[PDB]
Structure 1
Amino acid sequence: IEVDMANGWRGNASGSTSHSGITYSADGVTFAALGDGVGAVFDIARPTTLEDAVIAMVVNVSAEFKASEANLQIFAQLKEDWSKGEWDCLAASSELTTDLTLTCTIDEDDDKFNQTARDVQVGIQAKGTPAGTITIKSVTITLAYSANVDHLRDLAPSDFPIGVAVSNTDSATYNLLTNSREQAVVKKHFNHLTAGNIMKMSYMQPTEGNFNFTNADAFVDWATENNMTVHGHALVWHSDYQVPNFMKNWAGSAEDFLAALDTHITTIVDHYEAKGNLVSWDVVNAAIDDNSPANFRTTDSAFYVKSGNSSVYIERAFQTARAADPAVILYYNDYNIEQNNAKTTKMVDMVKDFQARSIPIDGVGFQMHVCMNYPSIANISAAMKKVVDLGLLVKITELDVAVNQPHCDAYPANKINPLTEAAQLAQKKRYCDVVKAYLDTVPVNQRGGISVWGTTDANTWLDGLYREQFEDEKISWPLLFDNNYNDKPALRGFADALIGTQCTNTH
């Protein structure tokens, strides 16, 4: 709460000496400190949840007030219940001179400031034998749950990994290796990791024949130290920000381009085989378009264009990855293929073609970037079953569940902001439904794992993707842990599914 400094302020006398009101300017709110108990205040409407809230004021006091040796008391009290309040803050003349920052934590014995009955009067007053003036420049007021899950990974009903995507050197704030809160949540709940960006193409090979393994190797070493396996992401992907410059600008033949693509794959696969912890790769990521009917991408993919207007690079990537390490599990990975419409159909036809022509492929990764109420559990189940029936592994690679999403629930007509308890419980049921559909649809020996695309809501990729539609607000809140790394009901819902407990949006 940033308190308005231009409206809503009042003089106050909490003692016998009368006050002389308040004065507005460009510097803030000013009053004369006429006697003991004389101050300035504003109101907060009922109901209030103000226990453990922190009041911070920037103030500025006159020479005469300094000379008076008077103290300053930040306080709050209930209107019509005047005797009840927070009276234990005091800034003594000692500490005063400049704009100072004075704070007051609202901390009461009986929880009196979590209440429904009265409005709340908040302010600052002089104590002692005061004189001169006080100026307040600004006021800010900084206002748990447990899922009771000890280790999420330990609840899987068969042997499949429970995994998470982490940030690395691509984020100063959220880098797994420098952020001890990220390390803690990961070590507590997961046994499987994906790098969010640093194993993508231009990160691994920024120029032709100069590979850069240093940062990704430190990530793999930390996974090994902590008894976790690594899913490699990704050997081939069209997204412009991570295509190596020399590939974007290829000026030679189609056969020479495909040979350079082979070198990229063989070098990276051989290196991570020898490092000793790399169990599966997304070999080709998101190569099908978003049209209906669906086709492989054309002009928006450097790989289609530089291969000579051909999708042959897809099968070649799989053949090359297999030759480099025959033991590593090979996935095709994509979004929207869980919807059971045009894109699902194109993916299934591609797998059938590959099986007919002896092109190696071990599984399909369903990224599973879903909305709260779309697509349906029936459609998600039917789409995964199409892959199960071809004898392949099914892996959920990038699960998140958006509370607001511009393509769902007629956004923004029903926008949820701020986040509510009802929305958190809806998210609990939704994570339960999706994980249960996976277990119900995919036989034990075809379960490639379930991973979520991030740790805390404070760093989800969705808020950046939809920044324009969201008006720069962080409103997708799509993951298992909140902005302070505490549990959300979402985590209880994931756990309920693993243990076979009914999926609900209740407590």
Structure 2
Amino acid sequence: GLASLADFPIGVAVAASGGNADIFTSSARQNIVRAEFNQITAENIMKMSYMYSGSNFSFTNSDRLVSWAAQNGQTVHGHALVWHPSYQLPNWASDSNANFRQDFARHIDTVAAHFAGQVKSWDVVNEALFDSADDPDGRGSANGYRQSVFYRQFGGPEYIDEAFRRARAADPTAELYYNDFNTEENGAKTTALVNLVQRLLNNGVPIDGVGFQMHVMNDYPSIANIRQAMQKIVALSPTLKIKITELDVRLNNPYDGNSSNDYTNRNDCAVSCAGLDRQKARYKEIVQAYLEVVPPGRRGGITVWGIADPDSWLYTHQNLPDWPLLFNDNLQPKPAYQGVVEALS
């Protein structure tokens, strides 16, 4: 399948929290992963709070998934050491906690050391950049940075340098990624990414690569913008790796000022519609831009953000159905799957 077409990881996000998408329980999903992919990212269960039972570390459920990957031909991309959303914050990660920096170091040291040579790569820090459309903390932009509890407790972005350094000491074999979304738009957040990254390289911070989420729509951003965004990063260093971490492709755009081109019914694109054909071309042109802009030896992987459309976070979004992935509600390849094969080939 897909993995055989590339010399770098071709990954998928897997669910492990019950219900239909559960990788342990869905032997049909297992067989797609075994046939098509060679790396897994935990969709949720390696997020920060999942490392804890109250205040003790607890790795039973995540060790389960990593041991599954190992026996099923998959490396694992660890997602994620440091990330802000309150639902996944350990209980220590509070403005009130005066031992915050200590508990922050023990987290990185303990988790990275625990998975030492069982995980290929980490999102060491995820989503550190201010995003106008996504600021739950409310605080607005601090020089390009999100003012999350980590920023607030460290007084600045130096929690980023510290997470890299600590992870690198704890596991000297792990590929260490900075990961974020909307940095492919080639706008203000892409510029903040380049400055973020230049600063870490200037400081001697051990970062191995930059992760682009790539949660895109069929027709936005344009690929010239995605191309340029990636080019700008590849230019920063002779060595720095580029990984597409979270690739999914929305047929619907609710931000384009045009409600007349929206698919509003679940039946619209269950078998055949123009949007599925554009989706084949859109997956194709992104994987092409990747191969063209990212030299061999610096390709960290392409990962798609789930197995089958009904598993997707976006199978609904903005009160609109969508069909964002390579496999359809029946676990059958979509024209999207072909676009990726044609690009990789």
- The TM-score normalised by the length of structure 2 is 0.92
Q: Percent identity?
A: 49
Show structure 2 runs of 5+ residues with no match.
133-139
Q: For residues 333-376 of structure 1, what are the alpha-carbon distances to aligned partners after superposition, in whole Å with 9 as ceiling and x for unaligned?
A: 00000111100000111111111111111110000001111111
Q: For residues 464-498 of structure 1, what are the alpha-carbon distances to aligned partners after superposition, in whole Å with 9 as ceiling and x for unaligned?
A: 5x2xx31xx5x110000000101100000110001
CA contact (8 A) 1:371 1:402 kept: yes
CA RMSD of aligned residues (A): 1.6
Are residue 260 (structure 1) and residue 103 (structure 2) matched? yes
Match of 1:196 in 2: 43
1:214–1:443 Cα change, 3 Å: same
Aligned positions of 1:89-488 closer than 5 A: 151-156=1-6, 159-168=7-16, 170-208=17-55, 210-248=56-94, 250-252=96-98, 256-273=99-116, 276-291=117-132, 295-298=144-147, 301-307=148-154, 309-391=155-237, 392-407=240-255, 409-410=256-257, 412-416=259-263, 417=265, 418-419=268-269, 420-463=272-315, 466=317, 469-470=318-319, 475-488=321-334
Counterparts of 1:162 and 1:479, CA distance in 2: 14
The structure where strand makes up a greater share of residues is 1
Task: Tell me which amino acid in the other structure corresponds to 1:232.
Answer: G
Q: For residues 417-465 of structure 1, what are the alpha-carbon distances to aligned partners after superposition, in whole Å with 9 as ceiling and x for unaligned?
A: 312432111111110000000001000011001010001011110135x
CA contact (8 A) 1:205 1:264 kept: no
Counterparts of 1:162 and 1:447, CA distance in 2: 11
CA contact (8 A) 1:455 1:481 kept: yes
Are residue 493 (structure 1) and residue 330 (structure 2) matched? no
Counterparts of 1:305 and 1:189, CA distance in 2: 42
Match of 1:144 in 2: none
Counterparts of 2:111 and 2:128, CA distance in 1: 20
Secondary structure in structure 2 of the residue aligned to 1:330: strand
CA contact (8 A) 2:130 2:144 kept: yes
The structure where helix makes up a greater share of residues is 2
Counterparts of 2:172 and 2:51, CA distance in 1: 21
1:258–1:411 Cα change, 3 Å: farther
Task: Tell me which amino acid in the other structure corresponds to 1:167.
Answer: A
Match of 1:91 in 2: none
Counterparts of 1:449 and 1:216, CA distance in 2: 22
Q: For residues 131-169 of structure 1, what are the alpha-carbon distances to aligned partners after superposition, in whole Å with 9 as ceiling and x for unaligned?
A: xxxxxxxxxxxxxxxxxxxx111111xx2011100001x
Counterparts of 1:288 and 1:316, CA distance in 2: 16
C-alpha deviation, 1:246, in angstroms = 2.6
Counterparts of 1:171 and 1:282, CA distance in 2: 24
Task: Tell me which amino acid in the other structure corresponds to 1:203.
Answer: Y
CA contact (8 A) 2:309 2:315 kept: no
CA contact (8 A) 2:13 2:40 kept: yes
C-alpha deviation, 1:171, in angstroms = 3.2
Match of 2:135 in 1: none
C-alpha deviation, 1:207, in angstroms = 2.8
Secondary structure in structure 2 of the residue aligned to 1:245: coil
1:241–1:162 Cα change, 3 Å: same
C-alpha deviation, 1:206, in angstroms = 4.2
**Structure number with larger C-alpha Rg:** 1
Counterparts of 1:260 and 1:405, CA distance in 2: 41
Show structure 1 runs of 5+ residues with no match.
1-150, 500-507
C-alpha deviation, 1:412, in angstroms = 2.9
Highest relative contact order (Cα 8 Å, sep 6+), 1 or 2?
2
Counterparts of 2:100 and 2:18, CA distance in 1: 32
C-alpha deviation, 1:249, in angstroms = 5.4
